[PDB]
From Swiss-Prot, chains A, B:
It catalyses: a primary methyl amine + O2 + H2O = an aldehyde + H2O2 + NH4(+); 2-phenylethylamine + O2 + H2O = 2-phenylacetaldehyde + H2O2 + NH4(+). It comes from Arthrobacter globiformis. Gene3D superfamilies: 3.10.450.40, Copper amine oxidase, catalytic domain. Induction: By phenethylamine. Keywords: Copper, Disulfide bond, Metal-binding, Oxidoreductase, TPQ. It holds the Pfam family Cu_amine_oxid. Topaquinone (TPQ) is generated by copper-dependent autoxidation of a specific tyrosyl residue. Disulfide bonds join 309-335. This is Phenylethylamine oxidase. Homodimer. Substrate binds at residues 288-299, 371-376.
Amino acid sequence: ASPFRLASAGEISEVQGILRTAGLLGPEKRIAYLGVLDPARGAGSEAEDRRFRVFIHDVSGARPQEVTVSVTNGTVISAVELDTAATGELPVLEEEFEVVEQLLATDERWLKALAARNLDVSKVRVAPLSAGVFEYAEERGRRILRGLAFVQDFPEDSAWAHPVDGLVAYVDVVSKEVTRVIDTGVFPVPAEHGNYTDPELTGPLRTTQKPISITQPEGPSFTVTGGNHIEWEKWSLDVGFDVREGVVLHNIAFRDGDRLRPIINRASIAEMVVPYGDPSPIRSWQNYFDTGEYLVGQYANSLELGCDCLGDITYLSPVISDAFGNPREIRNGICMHEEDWGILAKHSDLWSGINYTRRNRRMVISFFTTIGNYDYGFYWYLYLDGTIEFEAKATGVVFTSAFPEGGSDNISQLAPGLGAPFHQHIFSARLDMAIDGFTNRVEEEDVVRQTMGPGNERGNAFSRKRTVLTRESEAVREADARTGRTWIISNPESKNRLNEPVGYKLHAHNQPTLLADPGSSIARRAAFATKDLWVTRYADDERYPTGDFVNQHSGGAGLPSYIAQDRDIDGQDIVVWHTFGLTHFPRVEDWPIMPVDTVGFKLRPEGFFDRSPVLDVPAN
Amino acid sequence: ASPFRLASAGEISEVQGILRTAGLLGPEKRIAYLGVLDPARGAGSEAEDRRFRVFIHDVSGARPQEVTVSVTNGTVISAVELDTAATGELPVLEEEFEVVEQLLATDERWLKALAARNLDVSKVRVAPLSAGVFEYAEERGRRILRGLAFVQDFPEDSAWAHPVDGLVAYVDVVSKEVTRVIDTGVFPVPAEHGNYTDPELTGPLRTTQKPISITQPEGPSFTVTGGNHIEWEKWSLDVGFDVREGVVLHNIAFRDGDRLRPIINRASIAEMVVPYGDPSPIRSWQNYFDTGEYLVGQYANSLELGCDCLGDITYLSPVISDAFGNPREIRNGICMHEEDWGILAKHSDLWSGINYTRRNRRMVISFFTTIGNYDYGFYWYLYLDGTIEFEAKATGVVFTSAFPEGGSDNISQLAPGLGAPFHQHIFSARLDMAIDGFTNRVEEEDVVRQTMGPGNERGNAFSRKRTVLTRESEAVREADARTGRTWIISNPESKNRLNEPVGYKLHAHNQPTLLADPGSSIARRAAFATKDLWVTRYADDERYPTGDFVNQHSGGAGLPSYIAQDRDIDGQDIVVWHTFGLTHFPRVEDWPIMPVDTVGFKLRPEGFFDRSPVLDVPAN
Ligand SMILES: [Cu+2]
Ligand SMILES: [Cu+2]
């Protein structure tokens, strides 16, 4: 039916069959990435043509391939061999993570390092992390993972409490070789346990928390049709899911009167990077591109009712491919529900004697993923008043290290001898805009202070200025909280009743962007993270701010490459890329398990409607 | 019992009796302000002495007085005559707002202005606004109000939709004379009505919203004793109420194990100013000091259950004095309840096999007030993890004007010919700190970027720096969102188990501060609003950032004067004053009644605890 429906188990199995038939999926092949492609711009095919893009890895060392197939037609549209040393390695395979600890367990260098620390190899867990790109020439064209050790005292023990500092190893997960073992010296391994379910640490559980019952007697106010099409309080959209990006929102539109007005064609978190700021050689290479290197959707959690999602929840169970092309369901991976959101509008008028109060509510679409020690929640909200918001929730267990005897300028102490390297969690939201259609433009709006004098004799006046970003070369912007800087996306060809172009205003949190030196590997690989806002001309192959292949890939692809085309963005099909994130200096309160910290952004209508769009909300 | 208990109707009746018998409350006297005084530093003296502070106005022109009485002993502790021309006029009386429209009704100049516009004087409402201090020497020492006109077509009509621009009058509310009527020219009066309950405008009401039921089968998890003492999930505090500041939180403390640890001695919104940025002479003088000039607590609304506050609500009905000393109860003026706040902490560990999820909740204490056209909600939040937060919700009807032909750089258009002058809503949160006691200090923390080179070969390192504010002369700080600037309040004499001073970190939203020219009257009268954070040494008489008598004060009062003392704040009894607000360029969406917009701040524990304080929270 709808070309925006979720991929089905059948479609995935069919893709597997098409690839096998084409001789592209033999025993040595593995699917590193598989996802359905969005319909092309404009009414092309007389009907729908469901296409899937796949990244195929070869465990024998042969070059991988990027393939696009039409599941509808049963054909391979294109198949290209990839030169990874140039364009990037494919995302890490879940099966390659296990390899690291296994290989190191029998490596003489690794064993000697553990022995020097009096550690039992059988109790040493190894965190298999992405390698990035540095000065190791032998790594070019190879699939490498770097391992950091943590001691697990017993089966249910939290290894993160026992980091083994001064040690790191590099492993080629295809040839199954340990390329390097670096030991910079022994550090005491923190002894205190971080078992947050241990009664001795938690103490008696409080019994003071009375129940909060949230229910909907007549069911939810939103409807779900076609499996993933949502209709709620005038909003209309399709909830998609991609193994790389996770939840993706399509065709966000608002029913204004008798017309369905588009606002955002596609909204997603196109990349997420977690750069560490500890200069120690043991972790100075540490940078997680959770989305681009690991694929966050793949690790989405099954959400439990009453615990993860409270109230009347409607679940979606997206299907993804496993390493062999077989479909795998992520049961209850997406939660959908509406929640009360306090007061919407209120006024008690003396002159008219009318007292008016209305309540607000929001539609929530979310999922939670786990990448090693961290767990991130991705939340999208739609409000009655037309506001759209995204919120990321960061929790889990902080990545640890030893805490240096003489303190540290890049690590904080969580417990005796236990340290937490400073780092950031930076996201990139890709917003393929469609304010009342595809003809859009972006204006940077700053508050303008005025000088006391002629025409402003009392010095109370203040104004605002808007600068249209006309070409991609002028569209790489930075925040300016001091001047209340925001960015407005409007449609110069669609005006409200007051003859002004309709628009939506993006309000950022103005948190610090990437802190790394501009000459670092990470500043180049995560270039998008160095600026708050980027605007590009829409293009089918410009999907991620870091390009298609992020794993062990240097600069050269992504946003910097796209912007160079210097295309016209003044009243055209454009895409907004907003960078936002948290800078983390772990506190003692973040140990042994950290309470949620959040960050996000929102867009509010700006002259999009002819008056408040919530005057028809009942008193209830 | 508790010296922090809410005032009783009887205590107010006692003050009235005391003043009366003392001959301080004659027929010409009016109580402009009345509130109970907080206990002085140190209460080692058994049995407190309930004292009340009172501002007495005289309608015959006689000198006003500031009186302090003891309801415990039934005596007048002090009574001092005020020289308003020097120290400022008393707050505006509710009965004075009425005289403006009434007086103008029979003034020839006013009638001539209305006749030229063909407006029925009986239909013209006049907004009685504070006057401030400008170039009118004859106003020094006199109580003046400036009036702006709005047409009300019928009893239930919203006059705000029909502003009468080009006209303004000044009135002496004591001598009851119209000192001036300024008519700069006729402007069309906007014709469209803004009646949000008129089916003609709202259209058919939605029938799509299903109910959301929030209940607590076993009641709330918090306990209320002594009338206003709250105990909830380890938190302890007293909820007070003042006619000027509104809800005030006292003795906020956290039960950590066996110790009841203080965090903040007193928290309140000590001032809220709404400066307008329209250079027109009709409004260039407009600046509302809602707290200081009008007294926000006085206009607190009676909150309806299931309407203003949903769920299991526990109300407090504070009592205030009327203009004659009579007790007046504000039925259900304060809402108190706890609400679910999503995920608190979550981690699914591969190695231990332990999947952990805990939910969060917050304690809410709030009230809503109405000042003419606007309505503001003040919300204080206490979270399980120790976070303290404040949030202001701004709604109501936008103050209007005509929208000039040709447009405007200082007014936005809401409807045909209807304008909305630009303005700001700036709050000042006075936080009398008590981090583990009164010996505190403040440090400004900035993120520090590092250059690639020796000791940072990969250029990935980044750090932080903290600067102690030692004297008041260096305690006037500005925000720096780009460098992630925050402020930490710590106790240098109380250290956590890691030998680090315990503390709390204030996170600001970094919204723009006062925009007016530095030499403007408003910049001098609301100097607190020009900088984000101020730190002062505690003093009994330093209550408001704008001084005790804000109305028609020439400027420089409050914070600027306090800071000038240049006292030692490095490890002393200090007070933090945080400025935060919204800069409003009204959108079409804000008309005819505006959807809530918010702003606030929060403080999070920073090494205050020895580990996460929510490990004892049950799974449920
Ligand atoms: Cu973190
Ligand atoms: Cu406003």
